[PDB]
Symmetry: C5
């Protein structure tokens, strides 16, 4: 009956793309170089915004046919995020990066558990809270993304549960997640009102098998076993600018 409340940080876009190798193959090397030069300029623009504290971004190569690349971008406004989107699509090389999936969310800190001492202070001025709402992206070797929702299915209805019961379920969920400290970092984007599921979940690790371990362990925790609804899963490997030229060289 008591709705969850959230603190909300950067707006987020997960932008998945497949490379149109057949078309790219037809460009002569000089034109490929010009397009990669322009992309490097765009990416340095991204880096400038990161270095003044106004957003974040990273790129991972995606395994399988769902995508070749994910561009994960965070900005302080939907206007800025959409401007990045348009600037990217207007790049010459974007004609060769075909959209296969996207997700819009906002970094979310819910109030199921406390993130700071109660008592009148502005949480947005708490620098530990800020480090979570406006997260620096760890350059971990692997990324995992998937959206999810909470079930509203007969006797398994998360949104009919009272606050104290949801708090208990989230608390137990967090005990598992905290046991992966130093092995898995999570960024939770809330997407109710913004996209097709209720959260977009990003995990970072140097060992992709930690994704399998934590997701499996949580699936036996009642919060997920009874109430999790999952979308598609995407797994990838860190892709640094220095590796893009190689990737786009046939």
């Amino acid at each position: 009956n008591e709705a969850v409340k959230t603190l909300d940080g950067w707006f987020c876009l997960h932008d998945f793309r497949s490379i149109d190798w057949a078309a790219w193959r037809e460009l002569n090397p000089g034109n490929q170089e010009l397009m990669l030069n322009e992309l490097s300029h765009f990416l340095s623009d991204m880096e400038i915004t990161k270095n003044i504290g106004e957003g974040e971004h990273t790129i991972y190569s995606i395994l399988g046919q769902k995508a070749d690349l994910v561009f994960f971008t965070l900005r302080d406004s939907l206007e800025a995020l959409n401007e990045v989107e348009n600037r990217f699509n207007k790049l010459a090389i974007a004609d060769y990066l075909l959209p296969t999936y996207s997700y819009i969310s906002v970094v979310e800190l819910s109030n199921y558990l406390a993130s700071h001492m109660a008592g009148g202070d502005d949480p947005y001025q708490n620098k530990g809270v800020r480090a979570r709402l406006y997260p620096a992206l760890p350059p971990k070797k692997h990324i995992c993304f998937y959206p999810m929702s909470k079930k509203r299915d007969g006797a398994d209805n998360w949104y009919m549960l009272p606050m104290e019961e949801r708090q208990q379920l989230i608390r137990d969920h967090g005990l598992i997640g905290r046991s992966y400290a130093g092995k898995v970092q999570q960024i939770i984007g809330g997407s109710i009102g913004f996209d097709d599921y209720e959260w977009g979940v990003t995990l970072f690790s140097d060992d992709a098998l930690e994704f399998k371990r934590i997701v499996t362990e949580m699936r036996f925790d009642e919060a997920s076993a009874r109430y999790a609804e999952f979308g598609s899963f995407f797994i990838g490997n860190l892709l640094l600018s220095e590796q893009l030229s190689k990737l786009f060289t046939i």
Copy 2:
């Protein structure tokens, strides 16, 4: 069974921009097509001014769409004519259809001369910075069957739903379009706000209210930023 008052017919027209093909046009042809679109929109502005409809444009975040054209007309004939004349614009070959929704502005009984009722059936569109659209239906699933509830139960559920919505006065404006008989869900919901986080807040709060917790089925969600006709030239300039 609920009864309703019904206002303007509505089209949400979602479009993706085909940049790769647009890029191949020389600047003169791009300008010609944008000028044709500009006259199309000024003709829609006239219809808006004479009180025979409304329309607005928002840029859409993510890959679902680049633009939404939200048009309201007093007849399905007029609405279909707008749609066909839009599709026949040269520039429409570069605006690819990704999703659409058809509905009618709805006011339930949970009069047409009443000026306050008219303001809702024939709504002026607020030029808010952000839009949110999603369709939804009510469940008919085992023990969670909205349409098997007696009228008094549904009236209580709607009443509690409305109390939440009233607490967002001044922060979120809603247009509810009925679509039973017209499209694949039962309502199209359009929200307008200067702060997109208010969409997240109102939709989350309603999801813990029984009327939605037990009975709501949701389609896809679209969020966007207001786009004025005068900004189209810049958007389409590569």
Copy 3:
């Protein structure tokens, strides 16, 4: 305990999207030739109608699902498929892209009775608007229509019909049975001069137990009557 039906014309709902980008590239003379051929095809349809061997009508569809629906009725599946092939062989059909179709047969849940024939071989009323959607009856746990005893189903059907009778002169329905023919169990076509009547009747029925508990719906399509004269206007950019 299974229902028995009387069966009439075989029906095709053929939804098409207009490929404006390609159509735009045709010079005016070629557009005119293709419209001339289409006008010949439609007069062929009209001849079958006028000798009592079928029916047909065209409506413009709102939204992106389709631009046009061609609703054709014929006395055999061979004749229905032949119309289909003739239509797709038209030059202009290259610009009418297929987006959805439905196959059904007009259903009454005797064949010399004139009143029955008027239902099995229905004249299409030239109403301003059309509504189409397919549906099935649920087989879902405790909401299982096909496990109900005949007398229960009969009662549910009765109350459904009372609602329908109250829309006499506002909505005309054609019910096509499609069990064995398409992906749902019925195709429902509604005709009216006031499209809000579609919303009213479908909503009122959805609160009736027959639909509230047991109805499963496909996509809905709503449209406006398109006469031959208005086709030339439509296809003139």
Copy 4:
């Protein structure tokens, strides 16, 4: 504890649904069209040879609606032979104009819910009546109906949790309805557990398409289907002989 159904299995089956790309076909001049039709005609006569030496069957139906315009139903004695027919077909020049819209892989199946021959030590695959079912001759009926289906595993309606004697009863009652359509509807059941996305592909043949509606409707009120049937898409079509193809493909 729970006894799984056992099956006898015959020819492997491909239902290959295709849509005609009239816009592309229209751009060919008559000489090149006739030539691609000639190649198709030779292909079909080679299939006819395979049928005549008892190594398979095949038939063609025109499909109503937009799901497809044609179905090529092919039966062969091995998956290697079936896949070679498929590839050889796709390599026909005309196949570029026959766009794939749906396919189904199955194997002609005779379950052991009811007996097909007297118990004993005899090899059923030498029983000529059993063979007539496992390696079915295709009747040249005017109409075909195809749809895949599965049995539900959904809460209290779980077919695969039922004991054998209860499933036997349900199938027995199903068969009583089916046998009442003797001379009106012929069925070929292809099992596809492990081979495709549903558990069976069902093909019906009849000279009156309304018998399809009649039998399927009547069965849907039988408990075996009312409680446990899960249905895919339905396809209905009209017999198309090879000699009718030139007329079909003449614009």
Copy 5:
């Protein structure tokens, strides 16, 4: 309460459909050059197989879902993604259209032991046929695998394994865990010289409670072994 797993090679199931119409437009010379490049690519993968750093095989797939599956196993996600990108950059890959893929890791559950290594880093038997499908365990009302206590689940897995052991020598299985990696929880590959053994084992398991009550299935793919030396014949029109 949660299962713990040993994890071996990372796996890619890469399903492709041949674009026959585009391939037909190529002159035989270009076709041969593209097939030569593919042959070199495959022989490089054979080297990786011979030094024990991975595995791969190719099967032709029945029906329209695909024409080929490329099944590749590598010791890192970096090495797997590199194979994938190298493949897509082959000229011939423009004619091998992607129709489905699966990412998993060979999994041994706890429900250098040289015998363990033979399962985690499996040699691929050159069986005449392959079967692939993904699956998950249900979390649906009263049929919720992940809410069962460990002892119940262990019993269900025990009975499941008895069935699998009775097919030893006829069916070889590779179970890939995919929780966190793809859309289902496992990818299941079966190998056999008799495709009917796929139907027999999968059917028999479906009447076992572990699958009857709790298994959720994706699409099924079946195919015939395709050696590198047979590719020229397949692609020659």
